[PDB]
From Swiss-Prot:
Disruption phenotype: Single deletion has no effect on expression of cognate toxin ypjF i.e. the probable operon is not autoregulatory. Single deletion leads to increased biofilm formation, deletion of 3 type IV antitoxin genes (cbeA, yafW, yfjZ) has no effect on cell growth.
Role played: Antitoxin component of a type IV toxin-antitoxin (TA) system. Antitoxin that counteracts the effect of cognate toxin YpjF. Also counteracts the effect of non-cognate toxins CbtA and YfkI.
Protein name: Antitoxin YfjZ
Taxonomic lineage of the native organism: Bacteria, Pseudomonadati, Pseudomonadota, Gammaproteobacteria, Enterobacterales
Family of the protein in this entry: Belongs to the CbeA/YafW/YfjZ antitoxin family.
SUPFAM superfamilies in the cross-refs: YeeU-like
Pfam families: CbeA_antitoxin
Taxonomic source organism: Escherichia coli (strain K12)
Keywords: Toxin-antitoxin system
Note: Encoded in prophage CP4-57.
Induction (UniProt): Expressed in mid-log phase at considerably lower levels than antitoxin relB.
Keyword Nucleotide-binding found: no
GO biological process, one term: positive regulation of cytoskeleton organization
Disulfide linkage: none
């Protein structure tokens, strides 16, 4: 638990989130608006940093290709490079809450 938390107020297993704000045909990702958990070595930091744009490169398209339309919530589970990110619109208008949880095993 924490007094102030950027993403949704959750301290369960997925205690890390990354809610993006809608604006124009692109989404603004603010580094100062997130939290870090655990620790990534110098050999894991660069390798993970290059994987980040891969997953985001798809989100920017999901709203277009997946046809964005505030109507109802729809949970989708993607899988790439062994890593799996979860995304959902929650049926919210002009808002998409997303979260990443790297596989341990």
């Amino acid at each position: 638990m924490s007094n102030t938390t950027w993403g949704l107020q959750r301290d369960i297993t997925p205690r890390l989130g990354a809610r993006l704000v809608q604006e124009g045909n692109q989404l603004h990702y603010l580094a100062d608006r997130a939290s870090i958990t655990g620790k990534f070595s110098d050999a894991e930091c660069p390798k993970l940093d290059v994987v980040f744009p891969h997953f985001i490169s798809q989100i920017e398209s999901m709203l277009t290709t997946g046809e964005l339309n505030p109507r109802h919530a729809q949970c989708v589970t993607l899988y790439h490079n062994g890593f799996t990110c979860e995304a959902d619109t929650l049926g919210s208008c002009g808002y998409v809450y997303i979260a990443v949880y790297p596989t341990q095993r």
